[PDB]
Design an enzyme around this catalytic site. Structure first.
Site, PDB file in Angstrom:
ATOM      1  N   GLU A   1       1.780   7.691  11.641  1.00  0.00           N
ATOM      2  CA  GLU A   1       2.880   7.322  10.767  1.00  0.00           C
ATOM      3  C   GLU A   1       3.986   6.624  11.545  1.00  0.00           C
ATOM      4  OE1 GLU A   1       3.304   6.621   8.008  1.00  0.00           O
ATOM      5  OE2 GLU A   1       4.554   7.921   6.776  1.00  0.00           O
ATOM      6  N   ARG A   2       4.625   5.646  10.910  1.00  0.00           N
ATOM      7  CA  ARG A   2       5.823   5.029  11.463  1.00  0.00           C
ATOM      8  C   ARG A   2       7.026   5.872  11.071  1.00  0.00           C
ATOM      9  NH1 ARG A   2       3.451   0.326   8.877  1.00  0.00           N
ATOM     10  NH2 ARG A   2       2.188  -0.815  10.392  1.00  0.00           N
TER      11      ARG A   2
ATOM     12  N   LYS B   1       0.817  -1.207   0.000  1.00  0.00           N
ATOM     13  CA  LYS B   1       0.000   0.000   0.000  1.00  0.00           C
ATOM     14  C   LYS B   1       0.852   1.258   0.000  1.00  0.00           C
ATOM     15  CE  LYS B   1      -1.803  -2.169   3.359  1.00  0.00           C
ATOM     16  NZ  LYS B   1      -1.866  -1.849   4.797  1.00  0.00           N
TER      17      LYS B   1
END
Ligand code: ATP
Ligand code: ADP
Ligand code: ADP
Ligand code: MG
Ligand code: MG
Ligand code: MG
Lengths: 460, 512, 173, 458
Positions: free
Chosen positions: A182-183, A156
């Protein structure tokens, strides 16, 4: 002057009491000095007399009871416009890229009402993405919404990187990327990939990282939406990327639990579908401009039925489903052509040529799925002379849907390709109609456009 | 209608003088004691997270700051406490000894030595609760950290700076895999940290004894929060361990941290929340149990050389730092939907799924490759392993697609029977005994033997003896090539020719 | 009902009133406060969500009968806790703690007809022995009971009525 | 010097002067009519109130009674004088013999031995039971736990282990009855007294008739005696009759102590209440405790929070299943779930380890085929899957064994099978050297020679 005082701190939830004239309104933003560092609180509820319950947009540790609180008389409002392109910002619109002050000219509140049904305009301009499978099987118009569904590791995030690059380089359109939950590793990869590919100066980035309180991860989507709406009002056609809806819904569940609301169907907040409708209904093509959207949505445990993906579906206009089985065979993008779908795939909008090509491809693959198990049990030499041709053409079609991306070059070293829709239809029609029965299968793998398959076969 | 610590003599004090003088905002008095939570009256200047000092040498963490009460959790045996005891608020937050001198020691979550080998030789103190490096201070993870397991290092690579979840049901090798990942670093230049939450002490003593048998203990820090220690000392233990790993990360070195059963930190935090009367969520877990693990696991990062120069004030130049996390989760009856696994599967960069059906069927380590994922992927592999694993992925994928017919295999055509009996052999090839870690040269050699069809004629029963014989043969005749691969990981036409020759000559002249 | 949340406040008010030998003034002060709580307009204000230190001051304003230090302080504490409606019960439990402290009791005597005033003398003399306390009597008349007498002292009762004898015979059979 | 102010079921609230409030776990006393009731305080609520659990019948308590504050925790007799005698949770003698002549008394709430003091042992312990010491061997000084539903064999197995380990063992022994039948306590007491081993066993009994406080603290009362014998330098056996009742008694009282419910109605402190006990039942450098614990699993649900949290505290876990008992295969151990920390090539040698893993592999392969056999019947198996299935069924039979304590049930005499004598039989069955015998030739026999000898009679 500061006119309120903290009276409770329980985790991320802070209660502030004001004199009963100055009670802040809901969603107003407060401010307090948490040590040598500023902290802003967003009002969630007016409860009782003078007291107001808020969610801290930051580290709650270090707060005393009785600190002075000053109420900004406006919601959280963020810088907007051309000044934000190429910058990274947090939910409060402060720069987190160390390049210094933003240079804003204008600030907008992140809470606003959706366009009336009176102001919408229906349009059928199909986005051209440059990805063979997404253009053929899941066309989507301006102002539409597209959902990338799948588990973990299917692609994705790199599919969204590639869409960003194509739209920014081939069409010079502005884009906004809202990294909900978010990472930080992926945010740094994304930043360096966009600056390397030279697209960064046409994308504005908003990051609410995972290591932050729930309110940040919940309101980052609205900050990104507000920047997208500022660009829309200029008359542009922006494209808004939301990096995971599922984490927007989890942030909502957390926030609702902290405020002590009574839980619902699987521990989800009671207001799930209304938060989702507040978000998704600002993304529309008005008469002045357009906001298109691509949204990654993690499906937990493959079930497609728990309330989060179940409630997102009501809003999408097309769905691309990614499977890890296809990815493990190595054919990225890993899109499943038989389960992905679009509301725009009908002859009146895509024309009989495109509709026919898409249904032809689906039919060939659907027949190959039949033939796989006869090939397994009886061996291929027993197939008819027509069925062996269907097998060869299905395998070639199945190879030709794969494509090398410009942003995947870091993974495999192979150079990326952009393929127009015209070449996509021409290639798939040629394959289905036998024009290429003389090429070997591998001439189609990771090839790009159809001429490049004939250029590759000579090398084999 | 129920009281809120409005009690006779406290009320009488206010009757005497309502606006009591501001005698001391620095101190207060215990009014309640139960289950390790005390309610404190006073402490007008307490701050959330602040350490409060009790009689003896004991502390509490102020977690609930309410209207006329502080709810604080005792970090140790609480039954000695009693109502009316005076208490003071220190201005401090919890800090823990930190430094290089901890390597090879066993310490509790407060950093006190518990192995009995004497006083620590720390290089100062570090705050337990700290913020992770921002987006702009990272660097992409592209260095391998080797576990030594053919199943993991080939198909689920771990890179320096990654966060790889190990998840599976009870008794499936979750600890064995993590501790083999520590032993293998004995000479890799990566410092290791093993923090054990809620385990019984005589298991920690046993894993420390195994680390001592192999050469690993002198290179690792063990942080112990046994099952009998109060909930606060179990809930804070992972942060104490991460604060010690950040000492190396922030100074241009590499570390690897293994949080044992973070699913037992979540239960300690649930107890603390339910005793403080906080709103229960799903499965009675508190609301912010995602925010508990998120800000723990976002500390495992790789930081660029500029952040390391700025941090060490110029002492270290041009070196990136790194901290790798391997949290462990336990799933009851394979339920990855439960509140704690569904969060930690979402935070981390990968998942290693250990399955009890494979573990019983003889496949050890019982990794399930069709459902495990590593998002860093080939970037965290030596290029020889990156080249050779591409064929293993598909060899197993086609086998998973054909598996259904294994119970009708007599009926199949020979064109697919070859795929099926090749998948069975590569699946038999990834089995591996415990405490037998493989250098990259040996893993690459065996995976090459498998990929290029040399197992096409070995009977399935003999794969293990074939592998053992091949490694023994190579260790005497071709030691220089192994010493080259182990040192460079390169892959050329030359390396491929030499490997082809090794396999040909072995399968010709030797036997297994 | 505030029977339980009134106990701490009544106990504190009584323990304070004793230290200062002002029990009677405190009782009258509480009796006035518990009355202002019953007014039609004030009972409206006590229900609406005002801030405690505003409700308390508006309540203090309506009473110059409270010794400005110690009664108003009690009002301010009860207001901070949101318990001004409990005053009508603080008064009852204050009277109870007083009657205990001074070893006093109050007996109801219920009869089919008024007593001869020598019976009352002997009844009081007897109860002041059943109980250590100096006992008042409140004679009351009820023609449902038809002979004998009921003596009720707190939650204890002595069912000397013939009505009781009849109902207690009926249930032997 | 204190007054009772509430009585809710088993928990009592007492009010003390502000300067005299008891400490946590101190024991109070009340004259419950013609009785003496001991209360153990659990919480110091505010304002001199303290909340307590009654160690006896709560019925008949009025409000306003006067309670006396004993200023020490519950304390039990301990040591050599308590040997061969039955005791309450309160350490009072329950057999009709005289007082206990104890010299010393210990408080039942203690800290676990330091990490520094622990010891580890590889010394295997041999039992007469084929399946246990094949699949899940356990070692001297370690913990064993028998997991099972209701009525599957976890008491008979413990009596067999008592017979096979405790008579042939020199040191003392301790048996704690925690919330199980009084009939079984009387039966065990008379078996011991009639075989003249009673002078080496100390018995604490807090059976299911008793109110929650007794079932709650009796396990600690037993651990205290085991710990005294340990610290004297001896090595001890500790048998616990059902440790699940110790947490169930906590669940019964938790809500009354005013604590919010957790996952399945369990107390929020389940894992801590369980760890604080099981962390002090361990061997140490000064002496060792070998313990066997029966662990009831409710509704046969092995994932219920209580068994799930108990699993982590044991070295060898033996899991009994109803679906095996219903086949008449006793002991009904499930060999695909029994496990041991001791099953290593380094500890039990390569032959034992290899045979155990071969047995597991065959039985798991048989589990995988049970659905295709159910749908399509057995004739659709490949010619060698039929061989796998036949050997799996033979192994299933052969794990059965007759017990000396089950003669009352089946009449057949008990058998004691040595380890050397069982790994040989299983190597034989697996390698194929006994295919000729029928399945029923293996059912309920000792060594393998008894199986080849039983085949002669069908
Ligand atoms: N690669 C292997 N080969 C053979 N046996 C193994 C292997 N890995 C682990 N085991 C065995 O499996 C058993 C269980 O392993 P381990 O204790 O690591 O699992 P676990 O998940 O930590 O269990 P627990 O949940 O009790 O901690 C150990 O006795 C170990 O010897
Ligand atoms: N088109 C592609 N080419 C090469 N590698 C890919 C491609 N798509 C995905 N990958 C691999 O998949 C991994 C994770 O993909 P990502 O998009 O992050 O998954 P998710 O959708 O779960 O975020 C990356 O490390 C990358 O190596
Ligand atoms: N070894 C055995 N041989 C025969 N029957 C047995 C054996 N073990 C248990 N049983 C049967 O199982 C029943 C259950 O008894 P028990 O073991 O006491 O169950 P529980 O474990 O609940 O106490 C026994 O009464 C007996 O009928
Ligand atoms: Mg993603
Ligand atoms: Mg483990
Ligand atoms: Mg039983």
């Amino acid at each position: 002057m500061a006119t309120g005082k903290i009276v409770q701190v329980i985790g991320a939830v802070v209660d502030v009491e004001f004199p009963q004239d100055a009670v802040p309104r809901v969603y107003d933003a407060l401010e307090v000095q948490n040590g040598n560092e500023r902290l802003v609180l967003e009002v969630q509820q007016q409860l009782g007399g003078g007291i107001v319950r808020t969610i801290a947009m930051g580290s709650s540790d270090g707060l005393r009871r009785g600190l002075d609180v000053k109420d900004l008389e406006h919601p959280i409002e963020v810088p907007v416009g051309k000044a934000t392109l190429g910058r990274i910002m947090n939910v409060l619109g402060e720069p987190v890229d160390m390049k210094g002050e933003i240079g804003e000219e204008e600030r907008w509140a992140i809470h606003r009402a959706a366009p009336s049904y009176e102001e919408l305009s229906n349009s059928q301009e199909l986005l051209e993405t440059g990805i063979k499978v997404i253009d053929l099987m899941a066309p989507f118009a301006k102002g539409g919404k597209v959902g990338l569904f799948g588990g973990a590791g299917v692609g994705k995030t790199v599919n969204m990187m590639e869409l960003i690059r194509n739209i920014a380089i081939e069409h010079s359109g502005y884009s906004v990327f809202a990294g909900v939950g978010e990472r930080t590793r992926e945010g740094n990869d994304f930043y360096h990939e966009m600056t390397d590919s030279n697209v960064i100066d046409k994308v504005s980035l908003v990051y609410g990282q995972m290591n932050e309180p729930p309110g940040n991860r919940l309101r980052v989507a609205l900050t990104g939406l507000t920047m997208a709406e500022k660009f829309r009002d200029e008359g542009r056609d922006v494209l808004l990327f939301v990096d995971n809806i599922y984490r927007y819904t989890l942030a909502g569940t957390e926030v609702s639990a902290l405020l002590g609301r009574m839980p619902s169907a699987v521990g989800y907040q009671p207001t799930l579908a209304e938060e989702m409708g507040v978000l998704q209904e600002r993304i529309t093509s008005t008469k002045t401009g357009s906001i298109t959207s691509v949204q990654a949505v993690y499906v937990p445990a493959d079930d497609l039925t728990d309330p989060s993906p179940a409630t997102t579906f009501a809003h999408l206009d097309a769905t691309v489903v990614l499977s890890r089985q296809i990815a493990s065979l190595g054919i990225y993008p890993a899109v499943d052509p038989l389960d992905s779908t679009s509301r725009q795939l009908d002859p009146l909008v895509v024309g009989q040529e495109h509709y026919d090509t898409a249904r032809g491809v689906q039919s060939i693959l659907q027949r190959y799925q039949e033939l796989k198990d006869i090939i397994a049990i009886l061996g291929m030499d027993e197939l008819s002379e027509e069925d062996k041709l269907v097998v060869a053409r299905a395998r070639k079609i199945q190879r030709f849907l794969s494509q090398p991306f410009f942003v995947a070059e870091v993974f495999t070293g192979s150079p990326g390709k952009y393929v127009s829709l015209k070449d996509t239809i021409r290639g798939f029609k040629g394959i289905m109609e036998g024009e290429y029965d003389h090429l070997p299968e591998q001439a189609f793998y990771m090839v790009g456009s159809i001429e490049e398959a004939v250029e590759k076969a000579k090398k084999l | 209608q129920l009281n809120s610590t409005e009690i006779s003599e406290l009320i009488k004090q206010r009757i005497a003088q309502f606006n009591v003088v501001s005698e001391a905002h620095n101190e207060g008095t215990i009014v309640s004691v139960s289950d390790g939570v005390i309610r404190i009256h006073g402490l007008a200047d307490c701050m959330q997270g602040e350490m409060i000092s009790l009689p003896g040498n004991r502390y509490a963490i102020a977690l609930n700051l309410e209207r006329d009460s502080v709810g604080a959790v005792v970090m140790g045996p609480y039954a000695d406490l009693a109502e009316g005891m005076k208490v003071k608020c220190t201005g401090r937050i919890l800090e823990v000894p930190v430094g290089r001198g901890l390597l090879g020691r066993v310490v509790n979550t407060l950093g006190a030595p518990i192995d009995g080998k004497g006083p620590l030789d720390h290089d100062g103190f570090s705050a337990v609760e700290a913020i992770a490096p921002g987006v702009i201070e990272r660097q992409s993870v592209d260095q391998p950290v080797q576990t030594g397991y053919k199943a993991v290092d080939s198909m689920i690579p771990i890179g320096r700076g990654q966060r790889e979840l190990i998840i599976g049901d009870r008794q499936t090798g979750k600890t064995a895999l993590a501790i083999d990942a520590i032993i293998n670093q004995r000479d890799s230049g990566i410092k290791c940290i093993y923090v054990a939450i809620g385990q019984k002490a005589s298991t920690i003593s046993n894993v420390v004894r195994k680390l001592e048998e192999h050469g690993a203990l002198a290179n690792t820090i063990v942080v112990v929060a046994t099952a009998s220690e109060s909930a606060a000392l179990q809930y804070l233990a992972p942060y104490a361990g991460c604060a010690m790993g950040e000492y190396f990360r922030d100074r241009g070195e590499d570390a690897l941290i293994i949080y044992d059963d973070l699913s037992k930190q979540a239960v300690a935090y649930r107890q603390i929340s339910l005793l403080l009367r906080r709103p229960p969520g799903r499965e009675a877990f508190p609301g912010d149990v995602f925010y508990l693990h998120s800000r723990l696991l976002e500390r495992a990062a790789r930081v660029n050389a500029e952040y390391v120069e700025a941090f060490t004030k110029g002492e270290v130049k041009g070196k990136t730092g790194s901290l790798t996390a391997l949290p462990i989760i336990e799933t009851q009856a394979g339920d990855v939907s439960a509140f704690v696994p569904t969060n930690v599967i979402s935070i981390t960069d990968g998942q290693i799924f250990l399955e009890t059906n494979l573990f019983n069927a003889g496949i050890r380590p019982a990794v399930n490759p069709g459902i495990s994922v590593s998002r860093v992927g080939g970037a965290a592999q030596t290029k020889i392993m990156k080249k050779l694993s591409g064929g293993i992925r598909t060899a197993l994928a086609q086998y998973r697609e054909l598996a259904a017919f294994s119970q009708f295999a007599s009926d199949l055509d020979d064109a697919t029977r070859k795929q099926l009996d090749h998948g069975q052999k590569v699946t038999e090839l990834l089995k591996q005994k415990q405490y037998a870690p493989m250098s990259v040269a040996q893993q690459s050699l065996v995976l090459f033997a498998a990929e290029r069809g040399y197992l096409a004629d070995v009977e399935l029963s003999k794969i293990g003896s074939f592998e053992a014989a091949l490694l023994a043969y190579v260790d005497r005749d071709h030691a220089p090539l192994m010493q080259e691969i182990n040192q460079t990981g390169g892959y050329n036409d030359e390396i491929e020719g030499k490997l082809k020759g090794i396999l040909d000559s072995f399968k010709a002249t030797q036997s297994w | 009902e505030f029977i339980t949340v009134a106990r701490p406040y009544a106990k504190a008010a009584f323990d304070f009133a004793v230290e200062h030998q002002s029990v009677e003034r405190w009782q009258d002060m509480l009796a006035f406060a518990a009355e202002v709580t019953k007014n039609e307009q004030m009972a409206e204000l006590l229900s609406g969500a005002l801030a405690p230190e505003t409700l308390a001051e508006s309540f203090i304003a309506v009473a110059g009968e409270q010794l400005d230090e110690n009664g108003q302080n009690l009002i301010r504490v009860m207001a901070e806790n949101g318990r001004l409606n409990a005053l009508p019960d603080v008064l009852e439990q204050f009277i109870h703690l007083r009657a205990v402290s001074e070893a006093t009791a109050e007996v109801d005597v219920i009869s089919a007809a008024a007593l001869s005033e020598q019976q009352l003398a002997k009844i009081s003399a007897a109860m002041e022995k059943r109980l250590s306390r100096k006992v008042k009597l409140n004679a009351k008349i009820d023609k449902s009971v038809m002979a004998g007498v009921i003596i009720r002292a707190g939650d204890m009762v002595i069912d000397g009525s013939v009505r009781g004898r009849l109902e207690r015979l009926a249930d032997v059979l």
